[PDB]
Design a protein around this ligand. Structure first.
Ligand SMILES: [Cu+2]
Length: 128
């Protein structure tokens, strides 16, 4: 299977994907995040964060309160399954994670934790 995916987060506050499917043959999965546009990280930063559907709101709330200095992610948040760093336009960051942290029959959500972004910048991830 392919065990990676290229995702874009643009100045329109949109991920070019609303749904990700991870193949079971994969032991590891990689997300290559880029950011088309021209806006800076302090006002249009984007990160790719993964958690269970149950944990999303909390990760987003606690991340918002963490500040730009911490990439808007609560330090050592156990609910975060995997995450890229917070990037601005023109930047790139990739993250690889263990697929064994996922199971079938559970809804996972990927989103950006920059203040307010998750309202539009979010999507589903499923192991299949
Ligand atoms: Cu964002």
């Amino acid at each position: 299977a392919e065990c990676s995916v290229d995702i874009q987060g643009n100045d329109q506050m949109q991920f070019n994907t609303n749904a990700i499917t991870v193949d079971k043959s994969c032991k590891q999965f990689t997300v290559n995040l880029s950011h088309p546009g021209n806006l800076p990280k302090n006002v249009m930063g984007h990160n790719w964060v993964l958690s269970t559907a149950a944990d999303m709101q909390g990760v987003v709330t606690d991340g918002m309160a963490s500040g730009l200095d911490k990439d808007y992610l609560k330090p050592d948040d156990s609910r975060v399954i995997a995450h890229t760093k917070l990037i601005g336009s023109g930047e790139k960051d990739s993250v690889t994670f263990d697929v064994s942290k996922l199971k079938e029959g559970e809804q996972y959500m990927f989103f950006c934790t920059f203040p307010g972004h998750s309202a539009l910048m979010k999507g589903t991830l499923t192991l299949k």
